[PDB]
Amino acid sequence: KIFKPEELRQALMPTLEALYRQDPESLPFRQPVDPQLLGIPDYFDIVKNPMDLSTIKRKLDTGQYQEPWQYVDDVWLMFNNAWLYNRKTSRVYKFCSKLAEVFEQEIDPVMQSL
């Protein structure tokens, strides 16, 4: 099945804005992780493939996907990175898990749609 670029944005962006809407849980994820700014200099020794909401939003704003699981792939990569780097007890890890709950709720019916 082919997917028109304007169609994905209009049908996938609601799932993305549902993540941005989570405050404060989306705050760690709205911009790429800057290890020097954040005081976590070891981040890239653990996270080899970074991803964040702003990169996803900019991709989606230029239709730079091809089918929904591509977008899913980036969102899950952002989640997996955060669960790998941050400790289970940590605020950012818990924020990530909240976002992941919201995202599964929103993405399951949009995935059934196409």
Ligand SMILES: CCOc1ccc(C(C)=O)cc1-c1cc(NC(=O)c2ccco2)cc(-c2ccn(C)n2)c1
């Ligand atoms: C060192 C701890 O920061 C992090 C560590 C790891 C990760 C990841 C994604 O693995 C993310 C952050 C992080 C967290 C927060 N905000 C909160 O944690 C928060 C907000 C309210 C209560 O808590 C903000 C920003 C941020 C925002 C702008 N910039 C430039 N940076 C980055």
